[PDB]
Structure 1
């Protein structure tokens, strides 16, 4: 309890912390529920302790803007350091200060609309592979587990977008690439109450990324150095200061994790919503059939034209912002928008909490895509709604993730309809761990149109 007196001496309200644990025992309902309760009983700002680490939650849109945009380069540059990371300290999302800046600048041209349009034909091919595997489990008449067919699709996209390795993950059970890209809680809570043990784990070459996948990828990069995708865009860039070969492998790993779990979990949440709201699902199929008459193939320009599709994605991401929280480490004693923030505090934006706050959303628990219609979108504050973050360190893959998910949705909805069944968890409950995912896997009935 050496710093458990910081928020009292600053006059900031918060939950009283236990010795050593801080407030971590309040994470037992899940930490998005912890954030809603703290927001409800403390107001606009509050403090709590992850073990000995102080964390200041902020909910004011102006303060969020100072932190994420205004004062990003000078005070709030980095995220908080986590458990044994090893050589993945070079990954863009884990790197810090001038080193992050270099990586951000080197990887920015990789995610432009120009390059994204060149990837559309490639990821559209697996759209069709998805529809192929979907027609099959629809004949079973068995409720389908969406995270499997989506999980496989998301892997197919990422493998072919990051390395050009075209594969059918669902029908090729064990390819050296598909396997290795497949093999990837208590330890996180222990680390959080035992952060002084992270240096011991690092020196012992223990790494929260399974080191066995990482040797395989470096090899594959080598057997692909001379022998359009993210690898070449990064290799051609080497042909600031240029990237290195090992740095190359760290970014790719980050892209798989992003590409795989975020894309597959968001797509599942969407089809849950479309199944439990047949009117929305019907209206979306009518917009799709009108833009793309007679199951025509989706294109970059056609996708950017589907306003209701965009509305459904945005609203799904309001209810389930898969990063849950934004965080920045306070580098130096500062005073933002009337309050003093001392060095070393983690400032956290409770995105999940803000997305479900009645101060800004009417009926926050209701799936209502019309919030994001061109009429009501103007009243939505970009620092309350922050599914991809904001400012210089926001989600670099936002445009790629949106395109990738919409391309799957179009093709899947052109051919099938999705209905609940006796195994569907209605209402959906979220897991209580540290990931935003359903408690029970989403299972739905899939009928061919």
Structure 2
């Protein structure tokens, strides 16, 4: 008695017509709003073919749970078509992001041992702390320079350089110098290419490669140029590290970074390692930086919450007697505030899985091989799933009612193919915010609501200018 697939509410079966109306009414850079509006229009489940790709969209955590309950051993998400086309056409070695089945599993398991396992990740603490402490020093320097007892500015560019320094430090065990007054321009080029690769992805999204070649010729060209900078720089770093290792040929007892571990004790070939280094580097720069910027924004918008997080951090530093490793298990509210930041400001608009087997959702039969998307952004703003969703309230994640948070913490995805950088990102952000909260109060002058723009990853729609006061 479950309804057939075609009875799922839908704007219609013409993908090109659907694409036309999406661009006309909402716009490519507002796909998150498109999702919100569609659930308002159709209810909690709908299907929409956009251009060539059809998906079923869900918002209800109970449906999300069923989706992930039926997951197979080698899950597949939606592959970004211009990314795939660039790698295939220009014959670039692929990493874990673009692989599937057994070849994906092979990379993933090798990578998990160096970047996910608690026994590997404990080594990240000193490397990430060093970078965050240097960030703090930059701000103290700018405050001194300003002569006003404070510093006001848009720090988005500093945050990109912070994220780059952090990911490179854990990968290479070496400082790139991106937080110094005089910066490596070739590393800045790498940073800028990552943003450009994301931004240029958007006009090609719902199109097959045959069409974006023909109607998005300039964008495709710019996109190819962004990825070329990414691969070229990453490959130089990796090759140089490989040869330096042989030049200094000493068996080190001290931790030397992820790459050292992979090259010395991995089942991965050098080519797989170099491909995955490229992805980790590119994945690390725009994700934590934007998420941290939103966190700072929410702290400035919610001064009482900022006070409570500071009070928690100071007590944890005291109780841990200064030790970072101990401290990180004593900041439950800070960690909750990160979940809360990702609820309202997800990096990823959706999660997606291709079904392995037929599946029923809300009395509708969804056939195997169908793409199903969980609308993460829409979920986070939905008042039936979160009390007062517009309010930044970290304590909602500590609720002893363990049905208030059921399948709600979805920012990094789920299961065996969840975010590969999740531990790096969680540790980088928590350590960053500990250092910031100990050192400054954050405010925004003339605070106004900052919206969101879809630039492949979700990002603030306009610049945010903070005021920092030393604490």
Give the TM-score category using the shorter length. 0.7 to 0.9
Q: Distance in 2 between matches of 1:349 and 1:400?
A: 24
For residues 287 and 437 of structure 1, do their structure 2 counterparts lie closer, same or farther at Cα, with a shift above 3 Å needed? same
- Which of 288, 295, 300 pairs up with 2:325? 300
Deviations 1:16-63 (A, max 9, x none): 365635334255171111111111221221011220211110234344
For residues 321 and 160 of structure 1, do their structure 2 counterparts lie closer, same or farther at Cα, with a shift above 3 Å needed? same
Tell me the CA shift for residue 327 of structure 1.
Answer: 1.2
Tell me the CA shift for residue 393 of structure 1.
Answer: 1.1
For residues 159 and 297 of structure 1, do their structure 2 counterparts lie closer, same or farther at Cα, with a shift above 3 Å needed? farther
Q: Distance in 1 between matches of 2:468 and 2:320?
A: 17
1:402 aligns with 2:426: yes
Q: Distance in 1 between matches of 2:352 and 2:290?
A: 21
- Which of 115, 121, 125 pairs up with 2:120? 115
Residue in 1 aligned with 2:98? 94
Q: Distance in 1 between matches of 2:12 and 2:384?
A: 26
Q: What SS is found at the alignment partner of 1:309?
A: helix
Higher helix share: 2
Deviations 1:372-401 (A, max 9, x none): 12535x223442431111122112322221
Q: Distance in 1 between matches of 2:438 and 2:319?
A: 9
Aligned Cα root-mean-square deviation (Å): 2.9
Write the mapping of 1:227-238 to structure 2, written as runs, cut at 5 A.
227=244, 228-238=256-266
Residue in 2 aligned with 1:144? 153
Q: Distance in 2 between matches of 1:181 and 1:347?
A: 32
Q: Distance in 2 between matches of 1:62 and 1:182?
A: 40
TM-score between the two structures when normalised by the length of structure 2: 0.84
- Which of 292, 317, 324 pairs up with 2:342? 317
Q: What SS is found at the alignment partner of 2:416?
A: coil
Tell me the CA shift for residue 135 of structure 1.
Answer: 0.8
Residue in 1 aligned with 2:398? 373
Residue in 2 aligned with 1:188? 202
For residues 107 and 283 of structure 1, do their structure 2 counterparts lie closer, same or farther at Cα, with a shift above 3 Å needed? same
Residue in 2 aligned with 1:3? none
Moved over 6 A (4+): 198-201
1:443 aligns with 2:465: yes
For residues 368 and 9 of structure 1, do their structure 2 counterparts lie closer, same or farther at Cα, with a shift above 3 Å needed? closer
Contact 1:78 1:97 in 2 (8 A): no
Residue in 2 aligned with 1:85? 86
Deviations 1:389-419 (A, max 9, x none): 1122112322221111010111111111111
- The number of residue pairs the alignment matches comes to 434
Q: Distance in 1 between matches of 2:358 and 2:49?
A: 20
